[PDB]
């Protein structure tokens, strides 16, 4: 209804309307972010019907500011409304502080607004799990995983979305400390479609640096994919 | 509410040994024109308190409604004789409303005087809002409060407001002795009102003298007689 608590404590102590929101994330698309010395790479899963549905949906890899990534995973309906609030927030902060919003501040806000929607009355919790890549006040890259419950934490290399457990356990065993520009692409690609089909059209990968977020084009994407199927043989 | 076009005049309140004695002319003037000469400017807002008057009549009539219904609300929620509001309580209530209006710019031009007996040692726990011997009051159980339209509030032994604050005040400040008797208070008040007749244009005879004693609130209408000083010679 209008102004009723729809998220309330189950007799065992859990919040059922948040627990169900987590299961809405699992029915999404996997997203992977990898950190490095001074840049972060983000690779996500995209689904397009052949010959139709031009890839202008560009769900994941959302620009927030000059240097702020966002690769959500969950209900695309709630993705736009949550993202647009941050973009509204990012400029307001850059107006009240005259300095671009750091990655940590944006993650704290996204975690705040998400947790706000599971505490107010007559509002459904966001069915979205996001991860943000950006630079702090000091120039230092960071990735901030987020959950629909509002919990957030910084991660070196985290995977969210559909069957993120399999990707995470793989990503945990072969992550180097400071990988190369072409290594981070490979690790993200090798991990993103460990659960996704090996086709190069399914994955969309972009790399974030100190300036001018760069989208990786299909040339090397196809090139590295052909380097992975032979890895699987 | 904006400009005092229908003004009252000075009222004089002194406390004598049997209680409060407050007097006031019964004239309200339309500027320089004595439009009404039988209006009363001393209201009874409680069995033991009375309310003064000066300046605009509309504002002081509106203020009387507030104090009147404040009494009845007290009277409804009254269980014993000690629950009744003291004259000091109304003074601190009139002070607050004048001040609240002063923060805004609608000050309801007035110089209200609140007087009465601030004690319950003289029994009146039988209230007839709609219709023996005097006692000696220690002069500390009597309250005579003043409220300027800026909110300036204070209490004293003889509060003269309006225009008697220049003539009657000098007489009282060198003649008011403690524990004045009944008729001695009146001859002192009468001497103060007579001067205002000669020296105030917006004043008149036909005084309304109200006394607040241990038995309650009284009323009577003299016709004080100014005629002195032999200016007739030509």
């Amino acid at each position: 209804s209008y102004d009723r608590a729809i998220t309330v404590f189950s007799p065992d102590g859990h919040l059922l309307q948040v627990e169900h929101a987590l299961e809405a994330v699992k029915k999404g698309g996997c997203a992977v972010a990898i950190k490095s010395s001074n840049f972060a790479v983000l690779a996500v899963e995209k689904k397009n019907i052949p010959k139709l549905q031009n890839p202008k949906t560009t769900e994941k890899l959302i620009k927030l500011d000059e240097h702020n990534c966002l690769a959500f995973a969950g209900l695309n309906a709630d993705a736009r409304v949550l993202v647009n609030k941050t973009r509204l927030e990012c400029q307001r902060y850059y107006l009240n502080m005259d300095e671009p919003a750091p990655v940590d501040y944006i993650a704290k806000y996204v975690a705040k607004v998400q947790q706000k929607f599971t505490h107010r009355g007559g509002v459904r919790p966001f069915g979205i799990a996001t991860l943000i890549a950006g630079f702090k006040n000091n120039k230092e890259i960071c990735i901030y995983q987020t959950e629909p419950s509002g919990i957030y934490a910084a991660w070196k290399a985290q995977a969210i979305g559909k069957n993120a457990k399999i990707v995470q356990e793989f990503l945990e065993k072969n992550y180097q400390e400071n990988m190369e520009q072409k290594d981070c692409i490979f690790l993200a690609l090798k991990a993103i479609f460990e659960v996704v089909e090996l086709s190069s059209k399914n994955v969309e990968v972009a790399l974030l640096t100190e300036k001018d977020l760069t989208f990786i084009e299909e040339q090397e994407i196809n090139s590295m994919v052909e380097l992975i199927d032979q890895e699987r043989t | 509410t904006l400009g005092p076009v229908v003004t009252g005049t000075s009222v004089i309140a002194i406390k004598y040994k049997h209680g409060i004695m407050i007097a006031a002319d019964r004239k309200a003037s339309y500027g320089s024109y004595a439009k009404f000469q039988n209006v009363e400017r001393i209201f009874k807002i409680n069995n033991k308190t009375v309310m003064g008057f000066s300046g605009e009549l509309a504002d002081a009539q509106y203020l009387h409604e507030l104090l009147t219904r404040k009494n009845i609300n007290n009277l409804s929620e009254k269980k014993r004789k000690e629950d009744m509001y003291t004259p000091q309580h109304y003074h601190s209530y009139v002070s607050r409303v004048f001040y609240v209006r002063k923060n805004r710019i609608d000050p309801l031009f007035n110089n209200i005087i609140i007087a009465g007996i601030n004690s319950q040692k003289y029994d009146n726990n039988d209230d007839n809002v709609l219709l023996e011997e005097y006692k000696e009051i220690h002069k500390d159980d009597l309250y005579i409060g003043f409220v300027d339209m800026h909110g300036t509030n204070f209490c004293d032994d003889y509060i003269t407001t309006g225009y008697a604050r220049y003539f009657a005040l000098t007489l009282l400040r060198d003649h008011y002795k403690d524990n004045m008797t009944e008729e001695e208070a009146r001859i002192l008040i009468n001497e103060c009102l007579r001067i205002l007749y000669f020296r105030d244009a917006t004043s008149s005879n036909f005084i309304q003298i109200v006394k607040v004693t241990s038995k309650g609130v009284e009323y009577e209408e003299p016709y004080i007689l100014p005629c002195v000083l032999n200016s007739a010679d030509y």
Partner: protein
Amino acid sequence: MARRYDSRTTTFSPEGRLYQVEYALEAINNASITIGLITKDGVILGADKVFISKLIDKANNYEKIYKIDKHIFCGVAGLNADANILINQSRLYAQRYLYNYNEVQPVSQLVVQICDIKQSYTQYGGLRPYGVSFLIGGYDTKDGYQLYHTDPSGNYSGWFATAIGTNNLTASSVLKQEWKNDMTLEEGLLLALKTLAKSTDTEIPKSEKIELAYLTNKDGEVYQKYLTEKEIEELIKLYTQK
């Protein structure tokens, strides 16, 4: 307290879905079919008129393909009643953008506005969702001809050809098998008839039926719509080659 009387229309299901949106999608899967097609000349929208009676005026009106702006138009498939609520809303959005920025609103920006309002009802408010989803084809000077397919849930997607409505699968199959990337306007119109005829398993359309419209920008965004007369030639042409 009407707590016992509430339906909790904005509450997650045990499997992480929303039942109200789940049922709204079912409502728009029983409505008349609508076809979208992008050609090099322009974008084609053609929907099927559900038969009511021969007494319908069927001369100067049809309730499937409306006009949202001079360069944007939509083909509705779902509850016709609340479509006019969103059509009027999107008409307001496309005209207030022009009020602020002094230029026509790009299609990709109107859709996100009309999808945010469509989504907002299933996020908070305790109200039922909009049981309506419509293709929104339009021409914008930035990214040319576009075609977007909305949803009661609020999530849209760009497309080259989509066939929402009843029996959409049999109309997406024919579109997927015959939509050449580069098509002329008359070629696309024939394709629209073929997918409309096959979706409702009729060999030939009747022209008291499916209606068609397009943009075909001629540096002035002509935005023409068919009266029934022009479709006999389209029906004649389909018969000759099929």
